[PDB]
Design a protein around this ligand. Structure first.
Ligand SMILES: OC[C@H]1O[C@@H](c2cc(O)ccc2O)[C@H](O)[C@@H](O)[C@@H]1O
Ligand SMILES: OC[C@H]1O[C@@H](c2cc(O)ccc2O)[C@H](O)[C@@H](O)[C@@H]1O
Ligand SMILES: *Cc1c(COP(=O)(O)O)cnc(C)c1O
Ligand SMILES: *Cc1c(COP(=O)(O)O)cnc(C)c1O
Lengths: 807, 807
């Protein structure tokens, strides 16, 4: 038992054991003779959950009495992962439970592996919402996460013949002990219909009704007895030949059936639009209801803050207007004032294919009233633009919420800026790019709205939970206060020359690597050398993230070995993992290339154990908690200007891995905090990318001037990595040579050289570890507690609190 | 008075004072009422010289009795600089003399400034010989430096209208107190004549005779009572209408009249060839004479080692053969064996224009016998090649000592390799290049002959003498043993975090800078900001050294300031100095460009004191001792593969300056010793240069893709830096754009970026100084004591000794 895991009191261990047996008996209806590991997991889950209830009820009662300003975080994604350990950590029950289960003759670690990940997210954006909920609860904010309870989350990835296969993530199969259905608070949501204009106002009639049933999940703060709520809506058909009618109820309930598996990509499908309005309509009614129970809406903005996680819930703006104008009967101008002061929008990308632009004919049919409100908003907005920039007709066209052309569309990002009092990017460089390019016009009109809120990660899940060993050796030196005040890690700089610490840091990493090396053989049958440098790149598969640049380096290493077999090279285990959106062909081809390279490299006798290429199957939150603590090198190599922020990069930094990356997203602030000498920066900067575009990017130039790059391309083209299918990778080569939007070749040379410098430092264990300490020591700024405290003060207008609520 | 400067004993100070007055009276024939500072300097010089005599006579008597193997270092250049302080340092008389002169009411520093530099060298090669003599004496080797006593050394450089003007360096005008003429040892040297073939041998007859008169100068070792000799030959006509005959004596004496001012450039002039044979013929007779007084020459190689400093004294090989075969009557094969075992050759460059290739018709007329011997050597050499590589006719052509073509020439480098048992480069990368390219054929034939002897500098003159303040704060921590065992500086690494040391190191530098900043105003009327970063590049002006790349950066800084005047930039004082060979037009244009840039930059109100460009006039040894201790940044930016070693780079490293440079010459070993993170490395490596050549270097490409570079070129072309003469720099631009053998543009981008990193570190005083300490601490390998110890053991076959000879 380690200190950071809490006390294992005799009274509490005894209490846990009896409640464990009570649940196993009364709740699961089983006895020790027929109970399986899953039964034991649930008995424990229910036992831990019981400890939340009291605090949960009291926290909510507390908000009712004090009536603070409420923060509503709207997101279509909440990538929660597992809840058991996180709950134990935040309640300081980990050692007690470890002890209690030990005494019952059970291995708690084994039971934790049985819990299904709540995979209601695709990647960074969804996981950001998860870290945010944790930080908001830890900072005592009266916050509520509002989303959709998808029956099926992100698909489980299977690799067959080196190809990705998708299979339904039936995460609710065995039930979810953490959620509490609240059918009594079911609300109606309207779709279709038409707009009627009567004497006193417009009316939305003849609509199709779908019920929204909420499910509440507790969100415990870190040892402060605060337990907030994440409310997820589930679609239900109202109760009103016969057989078919009953069966068709599924049409309405399909709304919350599945999470769209696209990360950073817009797909204009009606079902997705229905999901977006569904969460918005139900959430706003719930918000107003709670407000009226605290009518004058002038104080609405003083009691409510609505944060739009990207444009997915952008319909909250016209929906809030619809309710205030049509139902509450406020005049337009009053309603608009309230709406703007209530909403804030967070942008997460600048990639054109990721921006939501909904076809007018779709909104017209599905939400006729909202379309009229959007036109009115646009009309009044453009009048302000015209008045500020008289005669600038092109600006009017560029800023319109309505896009003209083959098919009229609504630019949701433009709608969000117009209806929000604050708009923020997620990393300093990203926020600057928004003001310099994409939203330049809007910035010029309302400079005050634009802010930056650099992303962060919660040190609870991303340090204490996944890397107890490191959290422990740190606590031994500076105490435990850093867990909720990550800036304190700075104090570790005074130990950079401490021989004892240096040895402990390196020991923790070696233990993590052995632990992971073992895991890979257990549930996946793969052997790797624990002494090699663990080079890992885990994140969604996308061309801008350039897993292909990583592939080129791997092949370069392989060719150099084959060229001079008896030459010494630092051993490496290159791990690449991540899911590809089902319809993203190039991403699926990249996964195949990776496994293909592995097939060749991993079975070449000459290479031996000097180089290994493994594709980490089914990358998800639970897997991230295992791989990150074991990594030595973190690959953050997106083309400069494409990764808004990145968060995986922060996770690796906090866990002892050195970073090789471009000056993109948060990488810039990370290098800035640790010192550029303690980072492996390479490649073009944003400015260099623009210059290349002005000039015109010609991949052929690099192919002609770099012999090693040419050899690799020819190996791919000739079928060297695909014997039976010689032209299998033709699309990849064609893309790289003629239409590479991300300039893979342009950063190849500098990337390979930088990787050599990494291998050089790895050969010096002591100096590698000292650099690692400099990184961990300066990762404090990337705690989501800092991020949330900034949102609270600069956007929501509320003060974070670290005060503990009574037991 | 500082510790490292010795004791100021009461008996010695009293003795010095009386001898000072004795010399002022009896030697200079002056009294205190008419004595000028120069008179005082000489009185002191003679007083110090007296202390050398006893040790000098005893050292030589010692070598006579013990009869050790003698080392003869032949060089046409010995860039000695001033002798007064160096002598005091090596005899531990500096404080005593400082005190004694103080008591006589004189400032010793003032008197030292009166001594003329013995400028019998052009640059690195000549200064290397000087450092070597010092180290050989310090290591107790029975060594003799043999050269020419030029009446006029390297010309004094004057800058008029921004142009270099040359004026005679009449360094002997006031006499030289250090030398002792030895007319009694005058030897005859033969020229012209013809070869007669008699029954018993060939005879060289009807020759013109020129006498060689030796002048001996003492070379004191560091506090070991050893005093070796540097013997310099002076040309004298033999004593046998009348008036004209007497006046024509000058024709013969012109041989030792002036040093050819070319550095790294071959000029095939007859006078130069005469100088080369002159030093060789006189030296060898002196060597043999001394040997016969120790006949069988089988033991000659056991008692004599002849080191050829470059090919300048290459005629020693055929001259030794001539003497052994023609005069001593040894058979050819025996003579050749002795010659090869006696001679060793040191190469200092790979630039084609620097290799000596003498026209056969010249040798034919001037040294007919030597030409016959050279043909015989070639004949026998090629027979060995033919036997080792049967049928390889092209190799025979490539390796011949005789080059065919428009005009037959003798490749002196080929002659040296053939007649030497050892051939060495002067830096690891240079030595490797010799084996991979230029001498590849020879390396293949006799791999055993090729070695490396990385250059070094003497820490006496280049630390203790020129930077007493730094030598002192170092001694305070680790003692004084490092002065003759520079590796001990390593012990300074344990003080890198010592706040006291860090402050002292930075204090010493600031003092040096103030001292130099003052000097610039005193004897040159120029004001500079002592708080700015001192960016200096001092060395001979040559295109391969790329002073032009430095110029481009300076102009870049200037344009950036003008672009954003109110933006903060680290202040810089860019100092560039060095002489250009009189007939090297491009070098003279580069000097003009530098002053021209200064004219604009130094008078631009907007720039202020943020940027200053000064051309250091008349750069020479004495000036180097002043500027180097005051530098912050050392510019070593030659195109990779062109600077054989460089030595100025080592001087800066030992004195507290950080280095920005290419991976060329010794820079590679310097970075290797200090750690690449503590060096500012940039640009193409040798391999990158070759690739560019394969491809074909096109400067236009860089001009088209780099806006800032384009602006600079257009400023030069339009006359921005030369109003009255708009096309003044047309040749420079033309060269840069169409025939730049050194790829200035190719390293521009990386150079400018690297310079930004330098400015960034300078803004952090504490970290800049800590990096400085890491450099000084690892500069030990670059002491010439290490270099000489390697020559002694691996080439000359003698053991260095640190034992003190009796007083
Ligand atoms: O802000 C959290 C992360 O959101 C990611 C993201 C952005 C989208 O627009 C859609 C999906 C998605 O995962 C960005 O790519 C990351 O750079 C950023 O760190
Ligand atoms: O070896 C001492 C230095 O000799 C220099 C040199 C070489 C020549 O061939 C002629 C003159 C000359 O000064 C090289 O340029 C330096 O790189 C080297 O450090
Ligand atoms: C943190 C995280 C992400 C985001 O990773 P990036 O490299 O920033 O894209 C994606 N997926 C999972 C499961 C994560 O834990
Ligand atoms: C050391 C020295 C040199 C050699 O400088 P590099 O930069 O190696 O060329 C040339 N001139 C003088 C006066 C020196 O002291």
């Amino acid at each position: 038992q380690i200190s950071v895991r809490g006390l294992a009191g005799v009274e509490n261990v005894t209490e846990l054991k009896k409640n464990f047996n009570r649940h196993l008996h009364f709740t699961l209806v089983k006895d020790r003779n027929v109970a399986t590991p899953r039964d034991y997991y649930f008995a424990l889950a229910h036992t831990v959950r019981d400890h939340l209830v009291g605090r949960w009820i009291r926290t909510q009662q507390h908000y009712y009495e004090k009536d603070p300003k409420r923060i509503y975080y709207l997101s279509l994604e909440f990538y929660m992962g597992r809840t058991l350990q996180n709950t134990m950590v935040n309640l300081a029950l980990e050692n007690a439970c470890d002890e209690a289960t030990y005494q019952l003759g059970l291995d708690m670690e084994e039971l934790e592996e049985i819990e299904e990940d709540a995979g209601l997210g695709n990647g960074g954006l969804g996981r950001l919402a998860a870290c945010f909920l944790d930080s908001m609860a830890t900072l005592g904010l009266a916050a509520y996460g509002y989303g959709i309870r998808y029956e099926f989350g992100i698909f489980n990835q299977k690799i067959c013949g080196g190809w990705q296969m998708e299979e339904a993530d039936d995460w609710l199969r065995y039930g979810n002990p953490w959620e509490k259905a609240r059918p009594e608070f079911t609300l109606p949501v309207h779709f279709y219909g038409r707009v009627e204009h009567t004497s006193q106002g417009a009316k939305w009639v003849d609509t199709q009704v779908v019920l929204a049933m909420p499910y509440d999940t507790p969100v415990p703060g870190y040892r402060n007895n605060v337990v907030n709520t994440m409310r997820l809506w589930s679609a239900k058909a109202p109760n009103d030949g016969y057989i078919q009618a009953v069966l068709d109820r599924n049409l309405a309930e399909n709304i919350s059936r599945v999470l769209y598996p696209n990360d950073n990509f817009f797909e204009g499908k009606e079902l997705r639009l229905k999901q977006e309005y569904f969460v918005v309509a139900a959430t706003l009614q719930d918000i107003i209801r709670r407000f009226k129970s605290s009518t004058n809406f002038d104080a609405f903005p003083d009691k409510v803050a609505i944060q739009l996680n990207d444009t997915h819930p952008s319909l909250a703006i016209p929906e809030l207007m619809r309710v205030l104008v049509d139902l509450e009967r406020l005049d337009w101008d009053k309603a608009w004032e309230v709406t703007v002061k209530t909403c804030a929008y967070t942008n997460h990308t600048v990639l054109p294919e990721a921006l939501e632009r909904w076809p007018v004919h779709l909104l017209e049919t599905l939400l006729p009233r909202h379309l009229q409100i959007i036109y009115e908003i646009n009309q009044r907005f453009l009048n302000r633009v015209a008045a500020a920039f008289p005669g600038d007709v092109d600006r009017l066209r560029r800023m319109s919420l309505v896009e003209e052309g083959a098919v009229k569309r609504i630019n949701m990002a433009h709608l969000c800026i117009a209806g929000s009092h604050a708009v923020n990017g997620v990393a300093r460089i990203h926020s600057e790019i928004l003001k310099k390019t994409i939203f330049k016009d809007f910035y010029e009109l309302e400079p005050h709205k634009f802010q930056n809120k650099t992303n962060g990660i919660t040190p609870r899940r991303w340090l204490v939970l996944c890397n107890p060993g490191l959290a422990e050796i740190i606590a031994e030196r500076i105490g435990e206060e850093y867990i909720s005040d990550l800036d304190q890690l700075r104090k570790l700089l005074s130990y950079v020359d401490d021989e004892a610490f240096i040895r402990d840091v390196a020991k923790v990493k070696q233990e993590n690597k052995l632990k992971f090396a073992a895991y890979l053989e257990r549930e996946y049958k793969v052997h790797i050398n624990p002494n090699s440098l663990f080079d890992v790149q885990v994140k969604r598969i996308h061309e801008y993230k350039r897993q292909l640049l990583n592939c080129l380096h791997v092949i370069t290493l392989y060719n150099r070995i084959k060229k001079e077999p008896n030459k010494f090279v630092v051993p490496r285990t290159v791990m690449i993992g991540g899911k590809a959106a089902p319809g993203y062909h190039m991403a699926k081809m990249i996964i195949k290339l990776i496994t293909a390279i592995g097939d060749v490299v991993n079975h070449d006798p000459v290479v031996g154990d000097r180089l290994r290429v493994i594709f980490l199957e089914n990358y998800r939150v639970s897997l991230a908690e295992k791989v990150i603590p074991a990594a030595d090198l973190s690959e953050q190599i997106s083309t400069a200007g494409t990764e808004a922020s990145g968060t995986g990069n922060m996770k690796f930094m906090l866990n002892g891995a050195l970073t090789i990356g471009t000056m993109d997203g948060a990488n810039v602030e990370m290098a800035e905090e640790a010192g550029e000498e303690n980072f492996f920066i390479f490649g073009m900067r944003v400015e260099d990318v623009d210059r290349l575009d002005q000039r015109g990017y010609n991949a052929q130039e690099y192919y002609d001037r770099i012999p090693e790059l040419r050899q690799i391309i020819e190996q791919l083209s000739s079928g060297f990595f695909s014997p039976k299918q010689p032209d299998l990778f033709k699309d990849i080569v064609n893309m790289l040579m003629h239409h590479d939007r991300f300039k893979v070749f342009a950063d190849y040379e500098e990337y390979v050289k930088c990787q050599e410098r990494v291998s050089a430092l790895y050969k010096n264990p002591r100096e590698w570890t000292r650099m690692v300490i400099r990184n961990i020591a300066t990762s404090g700024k990337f705690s989501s507690d800092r991020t949330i405290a900034q949102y609270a003060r600069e956007i929501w207008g509320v003060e974070p609190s670290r005060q503990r609520l009574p037991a």
